[PDB]
Ligand SMILES: [Zn+2]
């Protein structure tokens with residue numbers, strides 16, 4: 001007998017004999033898990049690590065939420081699936097268009113591929129803007145798919161999500177968006193789906209609310225992972241093959257006085273090339289956000305026609321805190337990004353700095369806590385832990401977070 005598989009974006013996924021789950025712990029710098037385990041708070045993960053496979057993996061650059069979640073969902077980098085940031089910029093018109101509609105996704109998800117092959121598939125997200133992207137191609141007319149967010153759980157319908165009111169079903173209220181509870185709801189839904197829906201493939205993805213606010217080992221960070229471990233214990237006990245990974249890590253990005261350490265790339269370009277001659281794009285969030293949540297460690301810039309790219313790149317690279325400056329072609333090759341959705345140049349900042357646009361009009365500091373963020377090479381390293389024995393599993397840099405489902409189904413097969 002030949003083995004059964006589903007081929008997605010040029011990769012062969014064996015059919016899972018038991019449920020295959022990947023958990024994306026948004027912003028889970030490996031240190032978070034080490035600290036919580038050391039504090040005695042994660043007995044399930046501690047045992048799972050001892051008996052299974054423990055690795056570090058590499059995220060996609062930019063180490064942001066959307067590109068990495070869609071990489072995990074498709075098993076491919078953004079050069080394939082097209083989601084390389086939260087929005088794209090069109091030099092003509094000067095328009096910034098949001099990249100939340102599934103129409104922007106250019107490759108099928110593993111979820112759709114398994115669904116079309118007759119599998120039962122579940123996808124649960126914390127925030128809703130990722131739900132439609134991750135659910136692209138799923139259908140809800142055969143009782144074989146469920147896709148909803150914690151955020152909009154009370155709005156789920158049979159026809160569009162595979163479930164009527166996931167909040168009522170789970171018996172928990174819709175959580176506050178800016179809370180740990182938004183992610184707890186995902187874990188709880190995942191457990192109930194594993195028990196009652198019995199998916200062949202399931203993805204659970206959280207938000208990095210806690211991780212932006214709290215460093216590894218502090219009480220509020222530890223409590224989040226203590227909470228997660230309870231659900232991990234239950235998922236594991238139910239017999240599923242599980243990969244625990246992250247979309248990206250998290251690092252402090254503040255000066256000694258606790259204020260954000262920012263390089264204002266638009267200001268610099270306005271001086272060298274002329275005001276607004278170039279356009280700096282910050283992929284981390286939506287462009288209308290102006291409250292410190294727009295500060296990440298990766299940026300791209302669209303330059304005026306004719307200007308010396310090579311010279312501008314050297315001027316930027318010379319600045320202490322700007323670690324990497326690459327042209328479109330090199331950046332897309334190295335970071336596996338689509339040329340048509342990236343600027344003329346790509347910038348990556350140092351470990352404890354972020355990239356901003358301008359000081360004129362400025363980006364206001366909202367929350368009190370010292371800035372923590374991601375986007376750079378220094379948040380590329382993430383945990384990759386499997387609750388099965390897998391001696392052949394690679395390690396970073398060869399192992400990618402978007403190998404999660406490949407190895408989850410392999411473990412399950
Ligand atoms: Zn994230």
Ligand SMILES: [Zn+2]
Pocket residue numbers: 027065208212374
């Ligand atoms: Zn974040």
